[PDB]
């Protein structure tokens, strides 16, 4: 039926009665002797509904015809039993009762309204302390809580000049007493006066709550339960585990307790029991209800004899076991099966093989239809009866049914959308499901026993959906990167690699062949060897400027295997690519380029022929491996013995005392490192070199045909490390602590390890397994967080309208680049026209899709950076615009509108995360940045700037290099000088911080006070003793009072002015500065005399996305002003930053231990590092956020994967960033009813300003806010999604008081209710559905 939104509200007591169909009186369920439901009890038929079919228990009626009559004997309406599962019943509470969630939400909803702390009101609720009301006639109070004895004595003081109450009754009375609207206005007036922020925030929370509460349809007094609903019995079934011995059903048990607890209280109320007893009873009643809801939020959970905590109502909803995960977001599905996997070489890429047994089952409904279409089956049961036969005709029909029907196969757990793909089936006699080898790799299938699950699409729409998208032929390209995921297997690649290799001399070598046709025949006859060298005539095709393919013929010198393989190659590809040994490297780019040149359709067929050929000649090659293959270098013993002698010298020298233990230790490992590497040199060099061959007389050397070398060299499997261990030495090894054992594993594997050596290796092996075990668990919980926040985003616009964008550069770290700008700009769109080399000429339009050729064209030019539009900059409302996203990785061309990119990005990041772990240099020209420097008496330039950087150009005119040059460091290179490696950049102090006499003159102790501020440290054996400055935080009061500053002087009696300004040049000093160029000594501009003292993967990326402020962040400047100290250091040190215009009186509190890049008179600008250390992203957002923080975050995460060499496309990260700052903060009245200081979702405020400013009305001023993904997701507006994510109760409460209404935007909401999500296909329908609106 039609509906569009979900709304949340608090049920007024009558509303429960409206839902009700009967009061449940008796705390009993069934007639245990003969199991009728208990009338008036937890399963009363007439309250809920008939137990059987359509008929009552007293059998007054026995057909549908009787619909619509009570039976006077046993009441229940003659109706379908299903109604029993639907209708609810109510309970009458003996006394008002408090709902716990509102009480004990982390911000106590009731407490906040009351402005009374959670702990206190609890006393009143539990009848252990009174709360007084209407006591203004006396010393008593509006709502003061008081001790029972305080109350009782107050009773002696006053008869009834007050009222004192306990329990929910008192709470509800207080709520009823609230002049709630005036209270908010009363508080609003207070806010205007409030002079302290800590007070303000507390206040702001309250008013906002009250405003929301009143504006909502909710009224607080309803929160106190008086009538209670009880779930329909069928939803709380009592299955007969063993006949009369039913399985436990907690919810019924809880009801049982409450009902009995309620009844017993009723009795005493009837009897008018003494007050103390009933008071206790009231609490015990509250206790039971409390348990019924949560059963654990109270001090102690209740448990049965089984000693397990009973499952409260909330339990079925909340958490991992909750409905959301248990049922809604994942569910068991009919027409499904699981099987063990196998590889079928004969299969074509689009095909899959499955067993007949499963197939016969899976398509039974289809079979019946065909049988009855055949007319062979008189009825369904007859059809089912025939199928039991498994008769030949059944198989004939099954083949007809399955003739082209697509099917779905998925491994578990899925990594990404490639994890599930569609296939066309073929039938198999066995029981395993057969998979094409090339595809399985993408699935990450390992045949060590992996199982797989199968599902069948039923309807026409699904079948087309499966064939159009999921079918394997469609999915050759990875979506995380527009690169072929289909690159052949280890075996397939190796066979071709062996085939493509050449032999210096071989059978049949040296003939001339007209073409591959005779080449195959000659090899097949055995008259010539596969890799024998040969001359051949060949034809190849070039596609013209438009694509028309024309042929050319030529002769080539080649090995035979290459010619035959060329026959498999389709037209339009140059022969040269195959005229070489083909390892996985060559095949990878060959296939990739082939597809782009020729398209998809030739590619898929081309892949199959490659796959078939590789297996065939891999078998012929007989590429076996044997122990003899592992040749060991004789140098292994020699180097080991040689190295051992040297290590003994180091140990002896330590015994001599000539070296420390640490130096002794680290020198030894270095000796081992050299020894191992020399072994690697000998081992690796020999194996590759191991072939000497005769060619028409005389001998020659060629790359070895050794099995082991071919396997590693081909890239099929292993690495140089593996062979080094096996043939060389297992090498240096470390404890679980990471400390290297001072002796490596000198032994290889070809010869066995010694016991201790092997025992040592166990530490490393287990550690690797240990890390993997927890990592795989930790990474999954990360991905779940990712998907939730990302899911909302969808491309809906074509263009958002922005001309703005971010600028792209190659990462320039560790000197020059470590990535190409070519790869990153690819597939994006410009923000502005590209400036051609030279000036004023534009090379590319302002919004060109930067596909391959233009990127090649750009890099051909001298470009260094380019500006591109971004999804974060995208101005789209409730979504994204296509042009901002640009190319689709899985399609090459621009994206189709209506696609939810967010899930794609999340998955793209998710898979690689598992692979993480949880356990002057060159030629160029010089350039400087953040430059401030002066020239010293030595004729060289020294840096006065506190953030100078060095960068270098390649004399082509493009710049790629960067370094930080310390403050006070002396520049060896000026003028933008040409430079080469070894011409080191500068003279700098990497050990300690200097202080520079920037002016030229005589250094004086003017205003540098002896004893109190500068003190002669003893300096021990030096003989000479040096005056040393002492810090404010350590020196006597005199150190504070007479703060010293290094001041130079000239003929004026004071330093010549700061160049261009009459200010004194005194350099205000920190402590530990040592001065022996004492008063009166000569000094020049820029000279210095001071020397002041200064991981992992998955967790690093994790907290980054959650954007946690680091443990101890760097201290950064803000505002453009000159700094100064005053509020002398006591706890925090205070500094004033004064902009010379507008807002001079800005000052901050700063920790004492941090070193400072400025002291007292330095002019500093916003965001400048006062100290190094991890930056809090929020402040980056605060200072210069949108573009800057994006680049910062993008680089940081990219580094983790760039370290691992994982080619994640950056644009996906931008998607996450979009959500991170989807929120915004307003500080303005503007001209809209947003609170003067308000936090909002950006889109809502953005559009509001669009109309508000279009009206000419003052738009509100806002800043965009940074939320960790976890925090952001929970903050989302569509509560349903957040409710399903985690911390359910804290979410629902949020919706409750708000009475929020959900419009079911996004995917998750639509998924839950099951209607078509706004995905590619569904979006079109949803788009048209709104067209109906």
């Amino acid at each position: 039926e039609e509906f569009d939104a979900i709304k949340i509200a608090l049920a007024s007591p009558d509303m429960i009665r409206s839902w009700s169909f009967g009061e449940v009186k008796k705390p009993e369920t069934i007639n245990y002797r003969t199991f009728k439901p208990e009338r008036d009890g937890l399963f009363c038929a007439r309250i809920f509904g008939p137990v059987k079919d359509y008929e009552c228990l007293c059998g007054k009626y026995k057909r549908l015809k009787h619909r619509g009559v009570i039976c006077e004997k046993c009441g229940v309406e003659v109706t379908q039993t299903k109604v029993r599962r639907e209708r609810m019943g109510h309970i009458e509470l003996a006394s008002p009762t408090a709902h716990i969630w509102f009480l004990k939400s982390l911000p106590s909803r009731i407490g906040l309204l009351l402005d009374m702390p959670l702990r206190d009101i609890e006393r009143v609720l539990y009848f252990e302390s009174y709360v007084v009301i209407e006591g203004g006639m006396t010393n008593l109070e509006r709502q003061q809580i008081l001790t029972e004895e305080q109350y009782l004595d107050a009773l002696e003081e006053f008869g009834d000049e007050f009222d004192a109450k306990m329990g929910a009754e008192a709470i509800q009375a207080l709520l009823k007493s609230m002049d709630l609207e005036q209270e908010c206005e009363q508080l609003r007036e207070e806010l205007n006066e409030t002079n302290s922020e800590t007070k303000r925030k507390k206040l702001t929370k309250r008013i906002k709550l009250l405003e929301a509460f009143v504006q909502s349809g909710n009224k607080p007094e309803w929160m106190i339960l008086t009538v209670l609903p009880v779930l329909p019995p069928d939803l709380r079934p009592l299955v007969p585990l063993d006949g009369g011995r039913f399985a436990t059903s907690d919810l019924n048990d809880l009801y049982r307790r409450v009902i009995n607890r309620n009844n017993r209280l009723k009795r005493l109320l009837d009897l008018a029991a003494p007050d103390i007893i009933v008071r206790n009873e009231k609490r015990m009643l509250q206790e039971a209800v409390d348990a019924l809801l949560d059963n654990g939020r109270r001090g102690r959970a209740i448990t049965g004899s089984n000693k397990r905590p009973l499952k409260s109502l909330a339990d079925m909803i909340k958490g991992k076991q909750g409905r959301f995960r248990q049922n809604l977001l994942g569910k068991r599905v009919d027409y499904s099966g699981r099987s063990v996997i196998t590889v079928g070489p004969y299969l074509r890429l689009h095909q899959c093989g499955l067993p007949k047994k499963m197939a016969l089952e899976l398509f039974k409904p289809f079979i019946y239809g065909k049988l009855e279409l055949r007319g062979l089956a008189t009825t369904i049961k007859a059809a089912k009866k025939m199928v039991e036969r498994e008769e030949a005709v059944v198989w004939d029909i099954l083949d007809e049914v399955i003739r082209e029907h697509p099917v779905l196969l998925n491994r578990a757990p899925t990594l990404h959308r490639l994890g599930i793909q569609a296939f066309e089936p073929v039938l198999i006699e066995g029981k395993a499901i057969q998979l094409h080898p090339l595809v399985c790799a993408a699935y990450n299938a390992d045949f060590d026993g992996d199982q797989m699950a199968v599902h069948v699409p039923l309807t026409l729409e699904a079948q087309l959906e499966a064939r159009a998208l999921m079918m394997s032929t469609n999915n050759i390209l990875s979506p995380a990167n527009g690169e072929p995921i289909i690159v052949p297997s280890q075996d397939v690649v190796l066979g071709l690699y062996y085939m493509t290799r050449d032999c210096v001399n071989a059978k049949g070598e040296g003939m001339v062949l007209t073409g591959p046709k005779e080449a195959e025949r000659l090899y097949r006859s055995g008259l010539a060897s596969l890799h024998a060298r040969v001359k051949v005539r060949i034809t190849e095709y070039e596609k013209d400027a438009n694509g028309e393919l024309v042929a050319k013929t030529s002769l080539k010198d080649t090995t035979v295997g290459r010619a035959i393989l060329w026959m498999i190659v389709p037209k339009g590809l140059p022969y040269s690519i195959v005229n070489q040994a083909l390892g996985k490297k060559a095949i990878s780019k060959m296939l990739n380029t082939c597809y782009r040149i020729l398209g998809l359709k030739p590619t898929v067929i081309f892949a199959d022929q490659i796959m078939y050929t590789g297996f065939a000649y891999a078998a012929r090659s007989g590429a076996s491996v044997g122990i003899d293959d592992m040749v060991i270098p004789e140098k292994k013993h020699e180097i080991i013995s040689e190295a051992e002698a040297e290590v003994a010298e180091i140990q002896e020298q330590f015994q001599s005392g000539l070296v420390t233990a640490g130096e002794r230790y680290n020198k030894v490992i270095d000796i081992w490192a050299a020894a191992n590497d020399r072994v690697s040199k000998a081992m690796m060099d020999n194996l590759q070199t191991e072939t000497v061959i005769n060619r028409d007389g005389q001998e020659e050397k060629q790359v070895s045909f050794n099995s082991i070398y071919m396997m590693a060299d081909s890239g099929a499997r292993g690495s140089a490390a593996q062979i080094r261990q096996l043939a060389g030495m297992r090498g240096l090894m470390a404890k679980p602590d990471g400390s290297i054992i001072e002796t490596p594993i000198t032994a290889n594997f070809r010869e066995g390890l010694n016991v201790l050596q092997y025992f040592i290796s166990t530490h490393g092996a287990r550690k690797g397994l240990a890390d993997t075990a927890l990592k795989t668990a930790n990474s999954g919980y990360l991905t779940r967080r990712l998907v939730d926040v990302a899911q909302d985003l969808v491309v809906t616009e074509d263009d958002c309208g922005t001309h703005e964008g971010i600028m792209m550069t190659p990462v320039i770290e560790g000197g020059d680049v470590k990535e190409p700008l070519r790869d990153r700009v690819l597939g994006r769109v410009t923000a502005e026209d590209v400036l051609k080399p030279g000036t004023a000429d534009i090379l590319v339009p302002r919004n060109t899709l930067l596909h391959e050729q233009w990127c090649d064209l750009l890099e051909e030019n001298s470009v260094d950076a380019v500006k591109v539009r971004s999804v974060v900059s995208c101005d789209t409302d409730f979504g994204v615009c296509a042009h901002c996203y640009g190319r689709d990785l899985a399609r090459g061309h621009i994206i189709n509108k209506g696609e939810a990119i967010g899930v794609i990005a999340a998955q793209s990041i998710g898979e690689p995360g598992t692979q993480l772990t949880m356990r002057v240099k060159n030629k160029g020209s010089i350039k400087l940045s953040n430059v401030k420097s002066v020239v010293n008496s030595s004729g060289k330039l020294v840096i006065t700037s506190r953030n100078t950087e060095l960068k270098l150009i390649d004399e082509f005119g493009r710049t790629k290099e960067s370094y930080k040059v310390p403050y006070g460091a002396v520049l060896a290179k000026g003028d933008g000088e040409q430079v080469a490696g070894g011409e080191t950049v500068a003279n700098w102090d990497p050990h300690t911080m200097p202080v520079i006499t920037e002016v030229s003159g005589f250094v004086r102790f003017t205003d540098m006070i002896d004893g109190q501020t500068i003190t002669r440290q003893t300096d021990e054996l030096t003989g000479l003793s040096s005056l040393v400055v002492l810090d404010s935080a350590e020196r006597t009061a005199g150190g504070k009072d007479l703060r010293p500053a290094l001041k130079i002087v000239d003929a004026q009696g004071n330093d010549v002015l700061i160049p261009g300004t009459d200010m004194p040049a005194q350099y205000f000093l920190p402590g530990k500065a040592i001065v022996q160029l004492e008063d009166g000594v000569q000094i020049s501009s820029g000279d210095t005399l001071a020397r002041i003292p200064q991981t992992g993967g998955l967790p690093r990326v994790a907290d980054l996305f959650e954007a946690r402020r680091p443990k101890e962040p760097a201290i950064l400047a803000e505002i453009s002003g000159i700094v100064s100290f005053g509020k002398e250091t006591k706890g925090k040190r205070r500094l004033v930053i004064t902009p010379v215009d507008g807002s001079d009186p800005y000052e901050e509190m700063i920790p004492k231990w941090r070193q400072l890049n400025v002291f007292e008179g330095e002019r500093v600008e916003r965001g400048d590092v006062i100290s190094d250390g991890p930056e809090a992203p929020h402040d980056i957002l605060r200072l210069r956020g949108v573009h800057a923080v994006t680049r910062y975050i993008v680089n940081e995460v990219q580094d983790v994967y760039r370290l691992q060499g994982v080619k994640i496309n950056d644009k996906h990260i931008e998607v996450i960033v979009r959500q991170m700052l989807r929120k915004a903060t307003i500080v303005n009245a503007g001209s809209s009813d947003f609170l003067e200081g308000e936090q909002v979702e950006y889109s809502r405020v953005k559009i509001a300003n669009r109309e508000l400013e279009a009206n000419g009305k003052v738009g509100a001023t806002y800043s965009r806010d940074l939320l960790g993904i976890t925090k952001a997701s929970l903050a989302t507006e569509s509560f349903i999604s957040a409710a399903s994510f985690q911390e359910t109760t804290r979410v629902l409460t949020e919706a409750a008081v708000a009475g929020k209404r959900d419009e079911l935007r996004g995917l998750k909401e639509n998924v839950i209710v099951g209607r078509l999500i706004p995905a590619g296909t569904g979006y079109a329908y949803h788009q048209d559905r709104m067209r109906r609106r």
Partner: protein, 99 residues
């Protein structure tokens, strides 16, 4: 193991589980995301509504297959009703909005 059709659990109309009982395979939560990654939606709709959680639709689907139509009626996942009842069984009032 394979199942085309079979009984359903009382507390929730979703198919039984496992091999001992003739249960059906669980479409994992993560795998839905993968499906969501592709633009296919009708498949997903059919997945939960027809194949998992709609007595009315799946029965009607059953007949249509015998009728050779291979068409589904949209239906409404039953378990969703269960959740609504439970939430409504709390002190929360929750409703569906027509407009």
């Amino acid at each position: 193991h394979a199942r085309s059709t079979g009984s359903y659990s009382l507390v929730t109309q979703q198919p039984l589980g496992g091999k001992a009982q003739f249960g059906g395979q669980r479409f994992g939560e993560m795998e839905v995301w993968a499906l969501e990654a592709y633009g296919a939606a009708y498949t997903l709709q059919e997945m939960l509504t027809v194949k998992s959680d709609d007595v009315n639709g799946r029965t009607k689907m059953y007949k249509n297959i015998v009728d050779g139509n291979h068409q589904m009626e949209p239906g409404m996942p039953e378990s969703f009703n269960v959740l609504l009842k439970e939430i409504r069984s709390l002190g929360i009032n929750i409703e569906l909005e027509d407009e």
